[PDB]
Amino acid sequence: KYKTKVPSPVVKCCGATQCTSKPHPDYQCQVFSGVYPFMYGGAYCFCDTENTQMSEAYVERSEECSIDHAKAYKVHTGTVQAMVNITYGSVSWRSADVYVNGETPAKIGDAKLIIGPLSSAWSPFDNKVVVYGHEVYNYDFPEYGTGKAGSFGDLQSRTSTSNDLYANTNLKLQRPQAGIVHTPFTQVPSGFERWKKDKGAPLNDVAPFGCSIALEPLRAENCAVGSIPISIDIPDAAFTRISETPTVSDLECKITECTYAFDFGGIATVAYKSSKAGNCPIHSPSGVAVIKENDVTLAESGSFTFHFSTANIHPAFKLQVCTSAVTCKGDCKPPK
């Protein structure tokens, strides 16, 4: 918002002073003749035609400007990054953050992270986007140099401290009269404020992929689209042998039941006899029935169960366990 002040309007008994270019935005001044204004308990400030009234004006800026003003931006290419959590192998929650670039060499513990970059290559933004408060808005273009009649460029200034008001309140003076010492006038209402009545839906509220935005970096927040070619080093020392292992045998799994639902809403078991007891992972190379489990102990005759969801009415598929892929087809499945 702007502001508008008025200096002392000139006055005499006769004659006139002169209006100048008192440097202010939209500033005006005009002589006024035969003013004949009175003052209370006075003598009308004249003996004759006063002729002396300049009605010199002044336009300036409001003080909310300090607290609150426009935030008009050009938005450029910039970057993408992201945080992850790795809980690998024998490792627990290791939450890690890094940039999208397919180059980033990052080592956490033994994990030499190299990330992506992401297949997808866009976020919903725009070069010309503005913001008040928490909200934020693509303003098609904030007409920076061009005084938009103050309709939106009410304060046409580079910065708060940039005291360059290339804006027009279209201030026009009216003739002081009625013996009244005053500066009747006209100018424009704060148009950008007039829009501050017509504010709309902030982009964060319109951002698809049910994802959000961060204030300071315009960090878009987790519009989960695309695929990421990651590359990570592992501790080859964390390996062990293959022959020392309690070996598989006697493979068979019972497809107990699954109903196609979101939660891993299907349980099925195995029937089996082991070489010797211990533990061994059960990976799902085919994550059709999305297994609750990924690694289990393998006791002697490990003949036990697990949980999984698939959207299937029924599969016929299989997956791996202890370096031994076994087949449990997948019975017919109820809906919810």
Partner: protein, 368 residues
């Protein structure tokens, strides 16, 4: 504080102005309305008039209106002024010349100190509003619920980041000093008042403290008695002539400051919502109009915008893609729509026909 208050009061004086009152459209009170400024979220109004108020002219007795009683200046009790907009104003405070009060919504201020013979009131129309409760349309600020930032003139009077220049005052014409010499004019000057006077011939238009009087106008009529003063210092205006003093740019603080505070509204009432699998029906019976959007979480948004207060309902459906929704201070939530199979993969051939009709809604149909 008091030190910026004393900066205000040390070299500033009251004055009066022909405030366009409402009793007879105009009034020359020291209560002359000015400095109309109310823009807090609470709708408090920090103002100031033609006369110093609050503290006495020294800067003491916040109940002493240092007001320009007529020509002279006076600081009497601020015992009673009717603080009232359209409705009785929710006045908070003041500061010397400045006044920081609040008012309920409406349009016209109705204020004037109960002098006893008069209110000397000045009244002005300016539409008044309650700052809307952020995300919702209401009337009152809810006592509790959802806490939100909200701007406000900080009541603290200890400021100097703001300031106003106590301008050099100027000229004042008078009549009463032109007494009669038992045959013609007779100037009578109280003190140091070099009252410019011009009878038919040029008298001392520089003004005199003497009692000099000229027979060129036996009448006191043409004699133009004009005082000039710079005792204390007040800022000029359009409703102020070009005073002789174009000086004294003494930037005296404005006490209060518009600052962003925080204050609490209340959350919306939750709606009725029923997962009629393959859709969901949404029903609310609220007390005010908020808005609810429903932005697609997919490739698009296709949201909703609307404001309703009355008991209502609506139905909607979506894929398991979830979807945004929030009416009122309610945060947005997003839920996959599923648990709706609606079809038997294998029955009779006619049954499997209805299936290859329904297993997909449409892809079934186009395939068929």
């Amino acid at each position: 504080d008091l030190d910026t208050h004393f900066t205000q009061y040390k070299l500033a004086r009251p004055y009066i102005a022909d405030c366009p009152n409402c009793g007879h459209s105009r009034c020359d009170s020291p209560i002359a309305i000015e400095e109309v400024r109310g823009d807090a979220h609470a709708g408090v109004i920090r103002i100031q008039t033609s006369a110093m108020f609050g503290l006495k002219t020294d800067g003491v007795d916040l109940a002493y209106m240092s007001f320009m009683n007529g020509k002279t200046q006076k600081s009497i009790k601020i015992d009673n002024l009717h603080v009232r907009t359209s409705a009785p104003c929710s006045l908070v405070s003041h500061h010397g010349y400045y006044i920081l009060a609040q008012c309920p919504p409406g349009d016209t201020v109705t204020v004037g100190f109960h002098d006893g013979p008069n209110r000397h009131t000045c009244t002005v129309a300016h539409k008044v509003e309650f700052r809307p409760v952020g995300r919702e349309k209401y009337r009152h600020p809810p006592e509790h619920g959802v806490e939100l930032p909200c701007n406000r003139y900080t009541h603290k009077r200890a400021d100097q980041g703001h300031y106003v220049e106590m301008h050099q005052p100027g000229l004042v014409a008078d009549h009463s000093l032109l007494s009669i010499h038992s045959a013609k004019v007779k100037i009578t000057v109280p003190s140091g008042a070099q009252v410019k006077y011009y009878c038919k011939c040029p008298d001392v238009r520089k003004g005199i403290t003497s009692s000099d009087h000229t027979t060129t106008c036996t009448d006191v009529k043409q004699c133009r008695a004009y005082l000039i003063d710079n005792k204390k210092w007040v800022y000029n205006s359009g409703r102020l002539p070009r005073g002789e003093g174009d000086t004294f740019k003494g930037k005296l603080h404005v006490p209060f400051v518009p600052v962003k505070a925080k204050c609490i509204a209340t959350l919306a009432p939750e709606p009725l919502v029923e997962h009629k699998h393959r859709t969901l029906i949404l029903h609310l019976h609220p007390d005010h109009p908020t808005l609810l959007t429903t932005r697609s979480l997919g490739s698009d948004a296709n949201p909703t915008r609307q404001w309703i207060e009355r008991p209502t309902t609506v139905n909607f459906t979506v894929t398991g893609e979830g979807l945004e929704y929030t009416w009122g201070n309610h945060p947005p939530k997003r839920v996959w729509a599923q648990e709706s199979g609606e079809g038997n993969p294998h029955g009779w051939p006619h049954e499997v026909v209805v299936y290859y009709y329904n297993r997909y809604p449409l892809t079934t149909i186009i395939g068929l």
